[PDB]
Amino acid sequence: GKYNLILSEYLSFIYNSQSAVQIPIYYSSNSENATLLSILSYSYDKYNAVERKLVKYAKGKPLEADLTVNELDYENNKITSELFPTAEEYTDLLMDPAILTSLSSNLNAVMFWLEKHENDVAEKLKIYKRRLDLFTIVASTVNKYGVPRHNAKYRYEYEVMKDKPYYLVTWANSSIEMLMSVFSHEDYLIARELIVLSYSNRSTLAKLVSSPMSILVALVDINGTFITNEELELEFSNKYVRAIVPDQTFDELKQMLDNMRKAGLTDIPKMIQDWLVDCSIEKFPLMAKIYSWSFHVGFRKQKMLDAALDQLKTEYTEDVDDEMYREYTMLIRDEVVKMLEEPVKHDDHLLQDSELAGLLSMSSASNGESRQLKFGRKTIFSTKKNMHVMDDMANGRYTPGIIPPVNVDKPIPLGRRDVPGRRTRIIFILPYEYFIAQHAVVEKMLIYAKHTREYAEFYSQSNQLLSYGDVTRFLSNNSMVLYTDVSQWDSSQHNTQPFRKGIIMGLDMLANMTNDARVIQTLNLYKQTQINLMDSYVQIPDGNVIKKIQYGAVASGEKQTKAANSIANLALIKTVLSRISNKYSFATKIIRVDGDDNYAVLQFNTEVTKQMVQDVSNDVRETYARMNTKVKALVSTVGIEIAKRYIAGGKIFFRAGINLLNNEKKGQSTQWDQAAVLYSNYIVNRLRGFETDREFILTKIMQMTSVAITGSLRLFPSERVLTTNSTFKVFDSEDFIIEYGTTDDEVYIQRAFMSLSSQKSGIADEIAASSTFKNYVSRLSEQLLFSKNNIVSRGIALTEKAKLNSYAPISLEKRRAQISALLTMLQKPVTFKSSKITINDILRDIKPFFTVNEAHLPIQYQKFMPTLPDNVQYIIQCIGSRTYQIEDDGSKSAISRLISKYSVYKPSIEELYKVISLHENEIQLYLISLGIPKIDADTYVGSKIYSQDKYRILESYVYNLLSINYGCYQLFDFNSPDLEKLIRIPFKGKIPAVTFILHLYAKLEVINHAIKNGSWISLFCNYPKSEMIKLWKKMWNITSLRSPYTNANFFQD
Amino acid sequence: RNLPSTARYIRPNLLQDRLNLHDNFESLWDTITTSNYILARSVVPDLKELVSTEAQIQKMSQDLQLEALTIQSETQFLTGINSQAANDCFKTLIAAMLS
Amino acid sequence: SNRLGQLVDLTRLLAYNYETLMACITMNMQHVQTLTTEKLQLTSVTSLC
């Protein structure tokens, strides 16, 4: 236990007074060698805690802000009284960190670290002397204007920020995030320029540093690559491809290094300067270090008019060539007929009721407008769209046929989504009837995209070498890759008229291919959303006035914007590659589009020279410019930039910009949930090359998970509360290892968190008894089936109860009751007694039968991701990277091929697991509640194919429990021939459920032993026949511990 | 293009080795035929359009009549069948004969 | 093969602009093999027929 040692040492630092006492609370598994639950703390003298210890670190000179480096007047670091004159006009939304942790908490987490490492040995001393020279700059600037005391909900009022500079809080937050990631001398020279210059230059610093990364991935030679097959399976190929670069790229890379010297950066353009002499892959992680560090400057929060002015003001002309727009509109028309040819001819059940298909899946839509609703006696304000339907279905206003206009009378409100170092993107806020019309038709466009080679939904898995590995499979010395960066994709001229009229023309060739009266109707309503968006006005508020701007283009926030933007690229890059073939003769190997970032691999006849690269790039940005789409045409021979991934020289490099101590939107979480987002943003940045200290993170989990009931008492939970596998998990003991503990007091506490895993909310039980909720449930049972049954109607009325957990105040009355019920268990050490099978109860019976021995494995495979940590790179080089991805979606089964066809619901794999192990007449009672007819659910039960479907659901459910497809286990090959020489388990037939879990648990204990220690072990399990039958009856009653904030911990982006 | 009458070129001397480095020089021949083995490995083309592994083991597990969920432990027939090792064997059979 | 009335129409015109522009030629039209050639893409001959 190491977190318990830092927890006791922290409270002896922040409470320096004599009146502070700490009472540890212990507990045991027996009645009468004990692990501790929490640590009490009574401290009374608490005024001026941080402002007294800051003065001993405030030396040197403070930073004087430069006031003539930004174009706008409210982006400079001026005094707030000089910027906002009165307290009535004070906008917090330009500097708000939007995290529930104040600046006075972040300064104690550094001053606690600087005391523990004040007198270390000569290797760890140089890290301390580099993190002290940076903290002198941060402390002496804050101490001049003082420390701003936060609000009760962690905002900053006007009266505490009156005499300070405006961005003092949101600069001291990001600079503490940067100085706690300095490890080498190269990391100290980057952090000094991004701390000094970031005090004045709040506009164009993250753009100048992160600019030359699209160029530098085209200079590094390839010597050995990973490729992928036609089906997505990995291969290793060791060709040699030379990098060819024209003389105008180096005349552009020299321009990017002289823009970085006008801004004042004088030691970041010396590392790129000294790397270009070699152009080597062995020094390239220095060039991705500078690209990853540039995103930690901070967010560019601006006014909504001032950030949507260059986007909404474009020059549309009629001096384009109209001969090129006829082929562009025809190629969009040919795709929509090609996508909906099979679900319209054979009339699918999903298109026949598009009104019901959007109603039962409106929890996937974006948040709409803020509207006043009335649910019985209560009056609530909500932006979720399925709450707008329950108010509109009661008052006699629910008309899904009539689609409202978005012209000058009723404009479209606008929301933003921004990323540091890029421009901002606007998001439409559409009514709730643009989601119902565009859901059953777009879902038929995204099943064709999962079987077509040129789209992005084909190469969409959990791994990252199998998805973006088709870039380098066509690479040779006679080919070139052509990745182009369209600047303003949203409002270009090729998107307003010919894109909406290419879809409308494609839905008129599908109104003559069918014979039902319903499929003509759902293809007419999807056509009606395109004529109304042909002339759309947008609404942007500024000051007193509200501006209405005409905007006939395509923005995000729609439903079709992920599958119809991919059609407009494959029709536009097919027209440009046909105009460039009048000067050259090639053969297009692959085209692959993902939104608005794409590539295309052209294979030439003769060898590629330096003249065929400079003159193809001048025929891409001159053919695009004939269609009024200005682009930055880039061609390369070795490496590209596919979407946020940088494949340079055979290796794949990611970006590591995730802001830990800042956020872009004010989230609706608690502190306990944002202490697991802060940890899971540290594991992501550690795997990509931005290593923050662990002891700064573990200090930040101490200051966020603690909760007080009185102003003098504090409760700090221990390691065994936060690390155990339950609802309340925050972090793990070792970093990349998910451990399931097996001790008689560790299963005793995991069952003790099973009582208060389900709490009730006082808001959702008053909505569910109101009259307008019963009117919404009653009119869904009419459309779902023509009959009336009492079983299906309670099965519907208790399904929209869980849909109200997406509402933000309802999902906060549960979580505020989780932590307030935990405090009665951390104070009273005795708990309750119950029995319920978890995953740890199964592993209690398997672990005493494994015998370990020492073993060795020589390295045989090489590394394709060179920014991974050292203990994970020993696993990959010894057992191999993943070759093929095993699916856990369950759609290969025969019950998930029946639910998806005959109904619109989607049941969770934790729901299909519980019902597949019951009798025949219990699967019947469940399948009718899904919407399946009685004659179909009598077929599947009466066919006895559920007996052979028991093992296709348990295979995909155990892979979800142990998190094999997600986490950091999605890199190692599990069917490798080098893990089977270590696992030696004799085979005993006729029980497949137990033999499967003996080989999946033995494969994890060998991997989790070689990350902790770096040495391999071999296992042997002579499991008896009398213990296999006892474990066989517990493989079906296993229950999982699901949490809402943990479902985001499975994916990276 | 067709070159003029004044175009000249220098011809290399490709005559076979007179030292006979394969005769009793066994530590100099082993490092001169490893050089021709790595160079011949970066030339032989790699296999694209292989049959997928999951659509092949599931076809192979119907002929052997294996049990459910334990296709890798019941028989040791289906071990080390990847696409990484299909391309590796085709390269190391062509490049071992050329060098 | 189906473009016949519109492919005879090329060579009646392609060999008439060549025939009526050759009358405005004063130097001898000698024919030897030059060094550098002018590239015809056969993809652009498909776009003419």
């Binding site: 030679d221 180096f250 330096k610 | - | -």
Partner: peptide
């Protein structure tokens, strides 16, 4: 300065990027 302009005279001089000079020996 003379130090930054000398990079653009070295970066094109080196032989690991130079290719196909022989259509210009004929030209």
């Amino acid at each position: 300065k003379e130090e930054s302009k000398q990079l653009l005279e070295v970066l094109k001089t080196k032989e690991e990027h130079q290719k196909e000079v022989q259509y210009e020996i004929l030209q």
